[PDB]
Amino acid sequence: APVVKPENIVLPTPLSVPPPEGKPWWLVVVGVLVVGLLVGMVGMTVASGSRLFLGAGAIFPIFMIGGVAMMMFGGRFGGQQQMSRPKLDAMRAQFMLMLDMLRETAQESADSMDANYRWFHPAPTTLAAAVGSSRMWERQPDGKDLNFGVVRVGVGMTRPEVTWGEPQNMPTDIELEPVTGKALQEFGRYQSVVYNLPKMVSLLVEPWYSLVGEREQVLGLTRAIICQLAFSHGPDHVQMIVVTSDPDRWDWVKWIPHFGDPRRRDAAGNARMVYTSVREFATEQAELFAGRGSFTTPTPHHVIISDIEDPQWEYVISSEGVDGVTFFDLTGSPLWTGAPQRVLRFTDSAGVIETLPRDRDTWMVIDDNAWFFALADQMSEADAEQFAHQMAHWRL
Amino acid sequence: CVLMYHGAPALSRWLSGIRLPVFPSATSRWVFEARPDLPTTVVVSGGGQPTLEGPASVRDVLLRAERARSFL
Amino acid sequence: LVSGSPAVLSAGVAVLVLLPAAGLTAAAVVPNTIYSPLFRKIVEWIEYLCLMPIFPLALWLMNVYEAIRYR
Amino acid sequence: GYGLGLSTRTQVTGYQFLARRTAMALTRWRVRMEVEPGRRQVLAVVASVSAAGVICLGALLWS
Amino acid sequence: GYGLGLSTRTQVTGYQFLARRTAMALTRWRVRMEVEPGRRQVLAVVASVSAAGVICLGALLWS
C-alpha cells in the first residue's frame, strides 16, 4: 500500500522596510536655487562667448566627480535615496526562491496524499477491476477501520499533511514589504488545500444522510455509493437494502451479492433485499436494535436506501437511528433533513455537493455553515449494471 | 526596433493579459482564508461523464502564458 | 467666435466633442480596471508637473521679466 | 492657554501637523496618514514660486 | 485595489521587480534570479542613449 506522512513547515518571515519620511520644504527651495545658479552661469557663458569663459564655467563646477561618492551623505542629510534598491531586490529574490523550495515540498507531499487517497478510493469507473484489491477492507477497529466505514463520494479540496507553521516575527503593517508580504499571503491562501482529491463520507458518524437535488443526480450518486461499497466491502461485512417506489431504476442491483438475503432462498439464489415499501419490511431483524451511537463494529453494517417518500419511517426510525444500520434518504424530505450535517445538497447542475465542513480525520463537523464539499462521482445505470455483471461472477 | 528588441518581453507580458498582483497599500489585513472553489469543466458529451475539476481561475495562467509566447 | 477661421472652428468643435467623450470613457474604464503602480505614479506626477510651469508663464504674461530687464 | 503667550517650535510643528491631519480629514474621509499628497503638491507650488523668483533675479542681471 | 489610487515608491520597485522576474520567467524558463543580464544590458542601452545626449550637448556649444 502507499505511504503518506504529515509534516510541519514554518513559513519564512517577510521583509521589512522603513517608510520614507519625505523631504522638507526648504530642500525644494534649495534645489530650485541650485538649478537657477547653474542656468545663470551657463547663460552668462553663452552671453560672454569667449572660449575662456566657456571653459571656466564648466571647469569649476565639476563636482559630480566627488558627488557620486558624496551621495552616501544623502542618508545623513535626508535627501532622496533610491540607491538602496539593488540590495532590496536581492533580498526579494532570495526570499522568493526559499518560498519556491517550500512550494515544491508541498507539491511532493500532496502527490503522496493523492496516491494514497486514490489507492484507498478509486473512481467508480475503475472499480470494474473487481479482483485483487476487491473487498479487502476489514472489520476490526485498528488499521483498515480508518477506511472501513468511509466511502468516496466525490472529488474536492482537502487540507494537506504539511502543516504551515506561523510566519513568526511579522513586521508591522507599515513596515511590511509589499511583494514578499503579498506572495506569502498567496502561498497561505493556495497551499492551504490540495485540489481534486477524493472526498469521503464516513458511514459511522451520522445516523443517516438525506440527498437533496435533481432525481438523476441523486440516483447516479446513489449507484456510485452502492458500487463503491460493493467493491470495497464484502457481502459478509456490509449488506444493502433499497426501499423504492420505482423498481425499474433499481433493477440492476439484483446482480450484486450484497443485496442477497442469506435467510430466504429462491430459484436465483439468495433473496434480493429490495422492498417496495417501508411497510414491506418483513425483516424485523434490523429493527430490534437500540438507538445509534456514532463511532469514534456490527456484524453486517446494513445500508438501507429509501426513495419511497413514506411517513412511516419516523416510527421505526427515531431521531437517533438504529445501531448497526446507516440510512440514505433519497428524495429529501423534512423528516430526514432535520440535521444539515446529514444533508448533501446538489447546488449546481453538475452535481456540486454542498454540506458542512468536516474534519479530515475524525469526520466530525468543524463548523455549522454549509459550504462547498465535493463534485459527485455520478455514475450511469449502464456502468452500474456492467460492474454488477462483473461482481456477480464472484462468490468468495 | 533596437529599442523594441529590449522591450519585447515586457510588451509580450502586457498584451497577453497577464497582470501582476495588486498590493495591499493601506488595507492592513493580510490573512484571508477564502479558499477559492474549483471551476469545473463539463465534458462536452455530457452524458455519464463525472465532470472534472481544476484548482481556480489561475488555470487561465496556462492559457495566457502560451499566448505570451506567441506574441513574443 | 472672435476668430473667423474655419480651421479654428474645426479645432473647437473637435475638442468640444472629443474631450468630454474622453472623460466619459475614462469614467467608464478607470474604476473597473486594475493599473500598474508605476502608471499610478505617472498619473500622480502629471499633476505636479502641470502645476509647476504656471507661475513663470504668468510672469511672462505680465511681462515682468521684460520690465525688469528694461526698468 | 488664552492670549498671545509664547509657544515653542515643537508646538508650531505639532499644530501644523494637526492642521494637515484635519485638512485630510476634511477633503478625504480617511485619516490614515502614512503618505500625504497635500504636502507633495504644496511643495510643487513652492517649486513654481521659487522658479519664478529665480528667473526674475536672472532677468535683473541684464543691463 | 482597482482604479487610480495612490501607491508608494516601495510598491513601485516591488512591481518593477515582479515585472523583471516575470520577464525572466518568460524568456528563460528559470527564475533563480541571483544575477540578471536583462538589467545589465538595459543599462548598456541607457549608456548608449546618455552618450548620444552628451555628444549632442557637446555639439550645441559650437557657434
XYZ file of C-alpha atoms in Angstrom:
665
model
C 0.000 0.000 0.000
C 1.132 3.628 -0.490
C 2.699 5.845 2.155
C 1.771 9.297 3.452
C 3.405 11.481 6.079
C 2.429 14.623 7.994
C 4.937 17.468 8.158
C 5.224 20.863 9.819
C 6.946 23.728 7.983
C 7.288 27.251 9.354
C 6.770 29.861 6.663
C 9.616 32.392 6.309
C 9.372 35.905 7.686
C 8.593 38.654 5.133
C 10.938 41.559 4.578
C 10.662 44.844 6.466
C 11.148 48.331 5.038
C 11.115 51.752 6.761
C 8.597 54.093 5.106
C 10.191 57.201 3.568
C 9.676 60.311 5.694
C 9.544 62.839 2.819
C 11.887 65.739 2.127
C 11.382 69.067 3.949
C 10.089 72.109 2.079
C 13.346 74.090 2.209
C 15.114 71.295 0.317
C 12.880 72.021 -2.680
C 13.672 75.734 -2.441
C 17.403 74.923 -2.295
C 17.118 72.612 -5.314
C 15.399 75.301 -7.370
C 18.036 77.842 -6.320
C 20.883 75.480 -7.298
C 19.343 74.959 -10.744
C 18.859 78.722 -11.055
C 22.556 79.273 -10.396
C 23.596 76.580 -12.881
C 21.454 78.021 -15.685
C 22.587 81.562 -14.803
C 26.241 80.566 -15.096
C 25.915 78.756 -18.437
C 23.718 81.579 -19.765
C 26.377 84.161 -18.908
C 28.908 81.905 -20.665
C 26.780 81.974 -23.816
C 26.313 85.739 -23.448
C 30.045 86.260 -22.895
C 31.023 83.865 -25.693
C 34.795 83.835 -25.132
C 36.164 80.287 -25.016
C 37.966 81.047 -21.736
C 34.630 81.700 -20.024
C 33.102 78.640 -21.714
C 35.947 76.610 -20.241
C 35.880 78.153 -16.744
C 32.093 77.815 -16.411
C 32.360 74.051 -16.822
C 35.754 73.505 -15.173
C 34.972 74.990 -11.766
C 31.519 73.350 -11.180
C 32.694 69.801 -11.944
C 31.598 68.454 -8.551
C 29.836 65.217 -9.583
C 33.283 63.519 -9.676
C 33.061 63.615 -5.875
C 29.294 63.944 -5.565
C 28.790 60.440 -6.964
C 30.510 59.267 -3.774
C 29.030 62.044 -1.569
C 25.566 60.602 -2.374
C 26.338 58.448 0.704
C 25.670 61.557 2.828
C 22.127 61.639 1.414
C 21.198 59.232 4.204
C 22.797 61.656 6.666
C 21.199 64.909 5.487
C 17.918 63.261 4.471
C 17.928 63.639 0.706
C 16.265 61.227 -1.682
C 17.931 57.802 -1.640
C 16.782 55.484 -4.442
C 20.149 53.674 -4.422
C 19.281 51.043 -1.788
C 17.133 49.305 -4.495
C 19.658 46.576 -5.579
C 20.062 45.120 -2.095
C 16.309 45.034 -1.546
C 15.775 43.374 -4.928
C 18.339 40.733 -3.974
C 16.540 40.153 -0.671
C 13.245 39.782 -2.538
C 14.690 37.258 -4.999
C 16.270 35.257 -2.176
C 13.028 35.080 -0.183
C 11.130 34.080 -3.308
C 13.466 31.185 -4.048
C 13.063 29.979 -0.462
C 9.315 30.078 -0.976
C 9.695 28.030 -4.164
C 11.574 25.349 -2.215
C 8.685 25.221 0.220
C 6.194 25.039 -2.641
C 7.870 22.026 -4.246
C 7.967 20.343 -0.827
C 4.218 20.907 -0.616
C 3.839 19.512 -4.151
C 5.591 16.232 -3.346
C 3.595 15.898 -0.105
C 0.344 16.485 -1.999
C 1.339 13.909 -4.616
C 1.907 11.365 -1.839
C -1.503 12.167 -0.323
C -3.144 11.881 -3.748
C -1.586 8.487 -4.480
C -2.684 7.211 -1.066
C -6.258 8.522 -1.258
C -6.896 7.251 -4.766
C -5.431 3.868 -3.817
C -7.924 3.694 -0.974
C -10.647 5.357 -3.068
C -10.622 4.511 -6.780
C -13.022 6.311 -9.075
C -16.322 4.447 -9.725
C -15.477 3.666 -13.355
C -12.225 1.972 -12.338
C -13.965 -0.404 -9.887
C -14.508 -2.856 -12.791
C -11.125 -4.387 -11.855
C -13.251 -6.458 -9.419
C -10.332 -8.690 -8.316
C -7.063 -8.418 -6.421
C -7.933 -5.286 -4.470
C -11.616 -6.164 -4.081
C -13.352 -6.485 -0.692
C -10.038 -6.061 1.110
C -11.219 -3.807 3.951
C -11.539 -5.224 7.435
C -13.956 -5.136 10.359
C -11.533 -4.772 13.223
C -11.192 -1.308 14.822
C -7.455 -0.949 14.051
C -5.835 -0.307 10.694
C -8.449 -0.719 7.956
C -11.087 0.811 10.264
C -9.642 4.189 9.250
C -11.234 3.386 5.882
C -13.645 0.542 6.718
C -16.754 2.646 7.201
C -15.792 5.514 4.884
C -16.934 5.903 1.273
C -15.591 8.069 -1.526
C -18.466 10.279 -2.643
C -16.779 12.809 -4.907
C -13.749 14.958 -5.508
C -12.779 18.221 -3.884
C -10.367 20.045 -1.609
C -8.628 18.799 1.485
C -6.051 20.151 3.899
C -2.501 18.884 3.232
C -0.383 16.729 5.510
C 2.171 19.516 5.632
C 1.246 21.991 8.351
C 2.238 25.606 7.811
C 3.875 26.911 10.942
C 3.209 30.593 11.545
C 5.474 33.171 9.914
C 6.688 34.466 13.271
C 8.179 37.955 13.720
C 5.839 39.530 11.149
C 6.774 43.195 10.700
C 4.145 45.802 11.375
C 1.822 46.615 8.513
C 3.575 49.852 7.617
C 6.974 48.124 7.565
C 5.712 45.084 5.636
C 7.334 44.912 2.210
C 4.597 44.652 -0.453
C 5.968 41.865 -2.666
C 7.047 39.325 -0.063
C 4.005 40.037 2.074
C 1.605 39.542 -0.819
C 3.430 36.432 -2.010
C 3.218 34.905 1.464
C -0.495 35.764 1.598
C -0.988 33.938 -1.688
C 1.068 30.958 -0.525
C -1.001 30.610 2.634
C -4.179 31.028 0.605
C -3.465 28.466 -2.116
C -1.204 25.971 -0.380
C -3.992 25.761 2.207
C -5.550 22.853 0.280
C -4.851 20.071 -2.174
C -7.308 20.279 -5.060
C -9.247 17.399 -6.657
C -8.697 14.672 -4.134
C -11.361 12.054 -3.306
C -13.928 13.450 -0.890
C -15.149 10.938 1.664
C -18.281 10.354 3.726
C -17.977 8.214 6.855
C -20.967 5.928 7.428
C -20.074 5.683 11.136
C -20.697 9.295 12.204
C -24.183 10.155 11.010
C -27.312 8.084 11.721
C -28.495 8.870 8.181
C -27.946 11.071 5.162
C -30.569 12.820 3.047
C -29.940 13.625 -0.602
C -31.427 16.885 -1.882
C -31.329 17.753 -5.559
C -32.336 16.586 -9.004
C -33.516 12.986 -9.293
C -30.889 11.649 -11.684
C -28.070 13.427 -9.824
C -29.209 11.757 -6.604
C -29.699 8.358 -8.251
C -26.334 8.497 -10.054
C -24.574 9.289 -6.792
C -26.502 6.506 -5.075
C -25.424 3.949 -7.690
C -21.850 5.158 -7.291
C -22.035 4.756 -3.500
C -23.515 1.262 -3.827
C -20.832 0.094 -6.247
C -18.067 1.653 -4.116
C -19.309 -0.246 -1.058
C -19.778 -3.417 -3.120
C -16.210 -3.349 -4.424
C -14.604 -2.237 -1.187
C -16.610 -4.303 1.297
C -17.545 -7.955 1.060
C -21.095 -9.266 1.422
C -20.174 -10.656 4.863
C -19.364 -7.184 6.230
C -21.895 -4.870 4.558
C -25.418 -5.756 3.462
C -27.647 -3.483 1.435
C -31.340 -2.574 1.283
C -33.225 -0.466 -1.268
C -36.756 0.729 -0.497
C -38.308 2.236 -3.584
C -41.410 3.264 -5.459
C -39.673 2.867 -8.850
C -38.003 -0.575 -9.025
C -37.105 -0.193 -12.726
C -34.421 2.294 -11.712
C -33.173 -0.310 -9.219
C -33.369 -3.416 -11.380
C -29.578 -3.507 -11.766
C -28.953 -4.178 -8.061
C -30.227 -7.777 -8.317
C -26.799 -8.967 -9.504
C -24.909 -7.502 -6.541
C -24.366 -10.204 -3.876
C -24.643 -7.646 -1.060
C -28.385 -7.398 -1.734
C -28.687 -11.160 -1.255
C -30.680 -12.094 1.828
C -28.917 -15.121 3.389
C -32.138 -16.115 5.184
C -34.545 -16.521 2.247
C -33.584 -18.607 -0.778
C -35.262 -18.722 -4.181
C -34.521 -20.155 -7.624
C -31.977 -17.438 -8.443
C -30.130 -17.896 -5.136
C -30.314 -15.545 -2.173
C -33.367 -13.322 -1.898
C -32.909 -9.748 -3.048
C -33.225 -7.249 -0.198
C -35.226 -4.766 -2.249
C -38.620 -3.737 -0.921
C -41.325 -1.585 -2.461
C -42.482 -0.010 0.818
C -41.236 0.625 4.329
C -44.290 -1.398 5.374
C -42.808 -4.253 3.301
C -40.144 -4.700 5.972
C -40.711 -8.371 6.713
C -37.181 -8.484 8.112
C -37.755 -7.210 11.693
C -34.102 -8.158 12.301
C -32.617 -4.753 11.574
C -35.427 -3.177 13.625
C -34.844 -4.687 17.078
C -31.690 -2.644 17.737
C -31.374 0.354 20.045
C -30.573 3.935 19.098
C -27.318 4.532 17.282
C -24.068 5.795 18.752
C -21.685 7.276 16.210
C -18.324 5.515 16.121
C -15.212 7.240 17.467
C -18.316 -2.985 14.834
C -21.696 -4.553 13.989
C -21.592 -7.833 12.112
C -23.159 -6.627 8.876
C -23.487 -2.867 8.659
C -26.816 -2.591 6.879
C -27.211 0.269 4.445
C -30.874 0.997 3.799
C -31.727 3.232 0.863
C -35.120 4.894 0.595
C -36.865 6.844 -2.133
C -40.358 5.696 -1.202
C -41.350 9.022 0.444
C -43.319 7.374 3.212
C -44.271 8.973 6.561
C -43.922 5.560 8.244
C -40.122 5.744 8.641
C -40.445 8.018 11.694
C -41.982 5.089 13.604
C -39.149 2.580 13.230
C -36.624 5.440 12.918
C -36.355 7.729 15.913
C -34.403 10.994 15.958
C -31.238 8.953 16.593
C -31.469 5.913 14.359
C -30.716 2.232 14.633
C -27.463 0.663 15.860
C -25.880 -1.321 13.063
C -27.672 0.443 10.217
C -26.964 3.653 8.342
C -29.609 5.186 6.102
C -29.647 7.157 2.862
C -32.749 9.237 2.219
C -33.179 9.774 -1.464
C -35.877 12.338 -2.339
C -35.031 14.683 0.538
C -37.909 15.244 2.950
C -38.328 17.311 6.142
C -38.288 14.092 8.179
C -34.745 13.197 7.153
C -33.395 16.735 6.566
C -33.607 17.666 10.236
C -29.807 17.730 10.507
C -27.910 19.910 7.981
C -24.734 17.895 8.647
C -26.643 14.971 7.094
C -27.939 16.798 4.008
C -25.894 16.512 0.809
C -27.331 19.206 -1.437
C -26.720 19.337 -5.183
C -26.320 23.085 -5.578
C -25.033 23.097 -9.170
C -26.304 21.084 -12.140
C -23.009 19.194 -12.485
C -23.532 17.646 -9.049
C -21.725 20.045 -6.733
C -22.422 18.763 -3.231
C -22.546 21.329 -0.507
C -22.640 20.209 3.122
C -20.908 21.096 6.374
C -17.093 21.119 6.574
C -15.893 18.035 8.428
C -12.514 17.172 9.893
C -10.417 15.037 7.549
C -9.543 12.759 10.486
C -12.498 12.412 12.873
C -15.198 13.137 10.219
C -16.753 15.370 12.894
C -18.338 18.648 11.834
C -15.945 21.562 12.260
C -18.390 24.406 11.672
C -22.105 24.774 11.103
C -22.124 26.830 7.895
C -22.845 24.947 4.679
C -20.016 25.172 2.164
C -18.638 23.516 -0.970
C -17.911 19.869 -0.242
C -17.480 17.869 -3.458
C -18.427 17.307 -7.043
C -20.257 13.979 -7.029
C -18.793 10.936 -8.809
C -22.118 10.309 -10.584
C -22.360 7.019 -12.467
C -24.699 5.818 -15.200
C -27.061 2.856 -14.989
C -25.131 1.043 -17.730
C -21.821 1.302 -15.856
C -23.505 0.161 -12.636
C -25.070 -2.791 -14.477
C -21.699 -3.628 -16.044
C -19.979 -3.609 -12.656
C -22.837 -5.726 -11.303
C -22.293 -8.279 -14.077
C -18.647 -8.307 -13.024
C -19.361 -8.667 -9.291
C -21.929 -11.444 -9.897
C -19.045 -13.579 -11.225
C -17.584 -13.960 -7.718
C -18.684 -15.925 -4.672
C -15.770 -15.811 -2.184
C 13.477 48.342 -33.492
C 16.713 48.244 -31.498
C 14.858 49.643 -28.506
C 11.899 47.406 -29.231
C 14.101 44.296 -29.009
C 14.692 45.228 -25.391
C 11.087 45.977 -24.722
C 9.681 42.884 -26.400
C 9.351 40.622 -23.306
C 7.578 43.388 -21.395
C 5.180 44.111 -24.249
C 4.510 40.407 -24.664
C 3.644 40.198 -20.983
C 1.347 43.184 -21.321
C -0.503 42.070 -24.449
C -1.066 38.560 -23.136
C -3.204 39.995 -20.350
C -1.027 38.672 -17.587
C -1.407 41.156 -14.752
C 0.851 41.231 -11.730
C -0.838 41.319 -8.284
C -2.360 44.363 -6.680
C -0.657 45.484 -3.494
C -2.318 45.934 -0.078
C -1.044 49.503 0.274
C -3.218 50.511 3.232
C -5.861 47.846 3.930
C -3.680 46.343 6.725
C -5.387 42.928 6.523
C -3.121 40.132 5.319
C -4.897 36.879 6.281
C -7.720 35.709 4.001
C -8.960 32.119 4.357
C -11.372 32.295 1.439
C -10.092 29.012 -0.190
C -11.299 29.564 -3.803
C -13.504 26.732 -5.028
C -12.927 24.612 -8.110
C -14.023 25.688 -11.563
C -15.423 22.516 -13.092
C -15.211 21.542 -16.763
C -18.209 19.597 -18.069
C -17.192 17.029 -20.689
C -18.774 18.028 -23.991
C -20.564 14.702 -24.499
C -22.154 15.341 -21.095
C -23.964 12.056 -20.603
C -22.402 9.898 -17.911
C -19.166 11.882 -17.583
C -18.417 12.925 -13.996
C -17.265 16.487 -14.538
C -13.586 17.339 -13.972
C -12.091 19.908 -11.592
C -9.332 22.479 -11.860
C -7.902 24.447 -8.983
C -9.004 28.068 -9.575
C -9.256 30.925 -12.058
C -5.435 30.659 -12.019
C -5.881 27.873 -14.589
C -6.101 30.749 -17.105
C -2.389 31.393 -16.498
C -1.698 28.264 -18.548
C -3.563 29.867 -21.468
C -2.083 33.346 -21.037
C 1.484 32.033 -20.981
C 1.045 30.258 -24.330
C -0.398 33.475 -25.686
C 2.558 35.485 -24.381
C 4.929 33.093 -26.143
C 3.008 33.515 -29.397
C 3.148 37.301 -29.098
C 6.863 37.256 -28.370
C -16.377 83.449 -32.027
C -13.653 86.099 -32.177
C -11.717 84.445 -34.994
C -13.352 83.736 -38.326
C -11.014 80.960 -39.361
C -12.777 77.712 -40.344
C -9.733 75.782 -39.119
C -10.271 77.344 -35.687
C -13.927 76.313 -35.931
C -12.986 72.730 -36.776
C -10.492 72.539 -33.911
C -13.028 73.998 -31.491
C -15.829 71.623 -32.376
C -13.355 68.731 -32.371
C -12.147 69.447 -28.847
C -15.726 70.080 -27.666
C -16.879 66.706 -28.916
C -13.788 64.636 -28.054
C -12.604 65.892 -24.667
C -15.793 65.226 -22.654
C -16.174 61.986 -24.598
C -12.665 61.093 -23.458
C -13.762 61.965 -19.937
C -16.748 59.644 -20.275
C -14.517 56.819 -21.455
C -12.176 57.462 -18.540
C -15.103 57.390 -16.121
C -16.333 54.102 -17.547
C -12.933 52.388 -17.736
C -10.908 53.561 -14.752
C -12.910 52.343 -11.708
C -13.178 48.814 -13.084
C -9.648 48.197 -14.350
C -6.503 47.412 -12.414
C -3.435 49.559 -13.046
C 0.277 49.230 -12.515
C 1.792 51.074 -9.524
C 4.163 52.701 -11.989
C 1.357 54.165 -14.079
C -0.303 55.341 -10.870
C 2.882 57.281 -10.077
C 2.880 58.818 -13.545
C -0.754 59.847 -13.086
C 0.219 61.392 -9.754
C 3.268 63.217 -11.101
C 1.290 64.560 -14.084
C -0.390 66.825 -11.530
C 2.758 68.347 -10.053
C 4.402 68.693 -13.468
C 1.385 70.561 -14.821
C 1.299 72.658 -11.657
C 4.880 73.915 -11.839
C 5.016 75.973 -15.119
C 2.116 78.296 -14.274
C 3.942 80.956 -12.217
C 6.778 81.523 -14.771
C 4.206 81.566 -17.572
C 2.102 84.021 -15.568
C 5.114 86.313 -15.178
C 5.585 86.009 -18.943
C 2.018 87.228 -19.382
C 2.624 90.260 -17.198
C 5.984 90.850 -18.981
C 7.550 91.226 -15.547
C 10.773 89.809 -16.988
C 10.797 92.363 -19.791
C 10.026 95.243 -17.430
C 12.816 94.229 -15.044
C 15.207 93.861 -17.958
C 14.294 97.343 -19.193
C 13.414 99.202 -15.971
C -3.976 78.871 27.264
C -5.612 82.046 26.023
C -3.943 85.127 24.667
C -0.672 85.788 22.902
C 1.524 83.739 25.227
C 4.773 82.264 23.956
C 4.985 78.937 22.159
C 7.810 76.583 21.283
C 8.750 75.482 17.770
C 7.826 71.893 18.656
C 4.319 73.221 19.269
C 4.416 75.071 15.952
C 5.105 71.846 14.098
C 2.640 69.991 16.317
C -0.118 72.401 15.366
C 0.821 72.356 11.685
C 0.612 68.557 11.849
C -2.849 68.685 13.398
C -3.861 71.219 10.753
C -2.750 68.927 7.943
C -4.414 65.901 9.546
C -7.644 67.871 9.926
C -7.409 69.065 6.317
C -7.024 65.475 5.152
C -9.968 64.507 7.336
C -11.913 67.274 5.639
C -11.191 66.672 1.955
C -10.885 62.944 2.194
C -12.721 60.942 4.845
C -9.758 58.859 5.911
C -7.098 59.843 8.432
C -4.571 57.108 7.821
C -1.752 59.470 7.053
C 1.285 57.308 6.151
C 1.546 59.288 2.905
C 0.073 62.682 2.142
C -0.228 64.262 -1.295
C -1.246 67.618 0.159
C 2.318 68.296 1.241
C 3.696 66.983 -2.068
C 1.655 69.362 -4.178
C 2.156 72.402 -1.970
C 5.854 71.628 -2.433
C 5.141 71.686 -6.159
C 3.592 75.130 -5.684
C 6.676 76.221 -3.750
C 8.820 74.961 -6.637
C 6.734 77.066 -9.035
C 7.106 80.225 -6.958
C 10.822 79.767 -6.297
C 11.426 79.125 -10.006
C 9.595 82.344 -10.893
C 11.680 84.230 -8.313
C 14.931 82.754 -9.622
C 14.078 83.680 -13.218
C 13.129 87.183 -12.022
C 16.594 87.559 -10.489
C 18.182 86.142 -13.660
C 16.263 88.879 -15.501
C 17.581 91.564 -13.141
C 21.253 90.983 -14.100
C 20.778 92.334 -17.639
C 21.571 95.974 -18.440
C -7.320 47.724 -5.361
C -8.917 48.998 -8.542
C -8.651 52.430 -10.049
C -6.048 55.162 -9.929
C -5.465 55.072 -6.178
C -2.144 56.199 -4.746
C 0.869 53.927 -4.440
C 4.137 54.111 -2.549
C 7.597 54.012 -4.114
C 8.301 50.717 -2.334
C 5.369 49.322 -4.308
C 6.774 50.832 -7.500
C 10.026 48.956 -7.033
C 8.133 45.873 -5.868
C 6.130 45.820 -9.078
C 9.176 46.504 -11.240
C 10.857 43.551 -9.519
C 7.909 41.280 -10.250
C 7.925 42.532 -13.838
C 11.589 41.652 -14.268
C 11.128 38.258 -12.605
C 8.182 37.529 -14.894
C 10.187 38.654 -17.930
C 12.989 36.288 -16.958
C 10.424 33.540 -16.466
C 9.184 34.313 -19.956
C 12.396 34.441 -21.983
C 14.260 31.886 -19.970
C 12.477 29.110 -18.097
C 14.344 29.541 -14.845
C 13.517 32.001 -12.076
C 16.635 31.695 -9.975
C 17.463 35.357 -10.132
C 20.763 35.827 -8.235
C 22.140 37.541 -11.347
C 20.190 39.074 -14.196
C 21.602 40.119 -17.559
C 18.386 41.879 -18.547
C 19.177 44.755 -16.215
C 22.833 44.790 -17.309
C 22.019 45.222 -20.973
C 19.242 47.755 -20.480
C 21.893 49.683 -18.547
C 24.049 49.334 -21.649
C 21.184 50.824 -23.661
C 20.929 53.662 -21.145
C 24.672 54.241 -21.560
C 24.169 54.446 -25.333
C 21.355 56.984 -25.056
C 23.083 59.132 -22.438
C 26.273 59.151 -24.528
C 24.307 60.318 -27.574
C 22.684 63.055 -25.467
C 26.034 64.185 -24.064
C 27.594 64.378 -27.534
C 24.517 66.299 -28.739
C 25.097 68.875 -25.995
C 28.822 68.971 -26.833
C 27.707 69.744 -30.400
C 25.433 72.559 -29.212
C 28.314 74.626 -27.739
C 29.820 75.387 -31.165
C 28.965 78.628 -32.973
